Design a protein around this ligand. Sequence first.
Ligand SMILES: N#Cc1c(Cl)ncnc1Nc1ccc2c(c1)CC(=O)N2
Ligand SMILES: N#Cc1c(Cl)ncnc1Nc1ccc2c(c1)CC(=O)N2
Ligand SMILES: [Cl-]
Ligand SMILES: [Cl-]
Ligand SMILES: [Cl-]
Ligand SMILES: [Cl-]
Lengths: 124, 124, 4, 4
Amino acid sequence: DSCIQFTRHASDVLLNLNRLRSRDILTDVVIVVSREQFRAHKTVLMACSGLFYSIFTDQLKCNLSVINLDPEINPEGFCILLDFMYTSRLNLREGNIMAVMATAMYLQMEHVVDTCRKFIKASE
Amino acid sequence: DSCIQFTRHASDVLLNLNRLRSRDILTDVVIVVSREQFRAHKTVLMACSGLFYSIFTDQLKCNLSVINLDPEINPEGFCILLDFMYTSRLNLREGNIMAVMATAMYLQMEHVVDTCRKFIKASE
Amino acid sequence: WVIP
Amino acid sequence: WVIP
Ligand SMILES: N#Cc1c(Cl)ncnc1Nc1ccc2c(c1)CC(=O)N2
Ligand SMILES: N#Cc1c(Cl)ncnc1Nc1ccc2c(c1)CC(=O)N2
Ligand SMILES: [Cl-]
Ligand SMILES: [Cl-]
Ligand SMILES: [Cl-]
Ligand SMILES: [Cl-]
């Protein structure tokens, strides 16, 4: 086509989606990770994670307002990844890298798994 | 903070949101523009438009599944802007620029109004 | 705005 | 990935 493109549009949309999440506006699911609960938008979760894409395209699970993750999933690891989904920023640290990688593998977030493997290989 | 950032994340999220829209997955509102209907996600509309941000933060309107636009709004103009919201690409042409600008003004999409004014000024 |  |  003969379209023009606004370079910052995608980033501005994501910034607004994060603002909506922070104010709990039109959030439609709560992700339970052991003792912790995280409110989010199903569409953003599906857009970032192979696991959530599978869950919310399921004819029964698409209607659930609560999703319970595997008890082996670390809440801090999940929190770091949920923040990444809404911001493009990953808070990767020596103290959390193993939990972040295991959570990214479970959530099926290939690019996060890739940078975790690379940061781990550099430290060995 | 000491975060790393994935450059393409925002663009990949928007691409997936557009794929969900094309397959009518978790769309939660229909925008009626005279004889035409457009299914969308409320969060994306709010993230792109001052008008939809106002509508869906309203305690009564947030719960509506149908929103009827002003009868002066051109459906093709709305379609071009809805595509822009989900893609960052604006199909701006001599034959549609006046309708696109009027629709962008109504929807409160300042950056679109700005490029329309600039393209119009260049042709006079 | 750019030509993509 | 980059340093933002
Ligand atoms: N929502 C949506 C969606 C759609 Cl519509 N099409 C294709 N992928 C979608 N999302 C999704 C699927 C698999 C993975 C990711 C996201 C990130 C990753 O590493 N794996
Ligand atoms: N959703 C959301 C939202 C939030 Cl949370 N905060 C601030 N603006 C939001 N969206 C929004 C408001 C005003 C305008 C636009 C988008 C584009 C434009 O030209 N005007
Ligand atoms: Cl439920
Ligand atoms: Cl990823
Ligand atoms: Cl309704
Ligand atoms: Cl805009």
